[PDB]
Design a protein around this ligand. Structure first.
Ligand SMILES: NC(=O)c1ccc(CN[C@H]2CNC[C@@H]2N(Cc2ccc(C(F)(F)F)cc2)S(=O)(=O)c2ccc(C(N)=O)cc2)cc1
Ligand SMILES: [Cl-]
Ligand SMILES: [Cl-]
Ligand SMILES: [Cl-]
Lengths: 99, 99
């Protein structure tokens, strides 16, 4: 589809068997999801921006379904104010910016 | 143009007569530029980032070029990790997400 930016570009995603609302975020290098269980090993990481930094757990090789498009990649889990789909997964579904 | 997301969508902007690098950030509601001199009065604005909320300065009706596309609108000034072109101006220049 084509998504305009009058409002936040929120979509429904499926991750770890849960449905969640997430923001298509071209400014995010990686995907960041609110606290949840994910299977596998993880390593701690810090990410930040305006307001400072948060600590997240980095899980690799996680499958997420985004608007019917399956993509696999790294997911950071931690206290993000909003669920974020970052570039690492946006590329996999063929998402571009156009103007 | 059509911009893919394998790398950060960094573009050249022109503001206050000077060229700067900025990030096309669909996850940002607003446009936030690093400390510089802008004309006119400013108003207070609280924005929520990944790490918390902070106060920045809001200037309205500011002339700005983004990837050569002329725009006029609201620009916030504050301690941002990189210059950010957010949804307010992305919308104005006709930028959509597509997949
Ligand atoms: N390192 C990572 O992978 C990472 C880092 C941060 C995030 C959170 N998402 C980013 C992108 N959109 C806004 C958000 N932020 C932009 C941003 C942009 C770039 C970077 C950096 F280059 F450092 F990696 C960090 C943060 S933000 O928090 O500074 C922000 C929030 C709101 C607004 C606004 N209202 O205009 C402006 C800026 C997600 C992932
Ligand atoms: Cl990845
Ligand atoms: Cl591609
Ligand atoms: Cl505006």
């Amino acid at each position: 589809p084509q998504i305009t930016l009058w409002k936040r570009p929120l979509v429904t995603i499926k991750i770890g068997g849960q449905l969640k609302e997430a923001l298509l975020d071209t400014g995010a290098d990686d995907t960041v999801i609110e606290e949840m269980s994910l299977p596998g090993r993880w390593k701690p990481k810090m990410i930040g921006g305006i307001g400072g930094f948060i600590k997240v757990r980095q899980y690799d090789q996680i499958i997420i379904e985004i608007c019917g498009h399956k993509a696999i990649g790294t997911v950071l889990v931690g206290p993000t104010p909003v669920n974020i789909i970052g570039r690492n997964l946006l590329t996999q579904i063929g998402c571009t910016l156009n103007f």
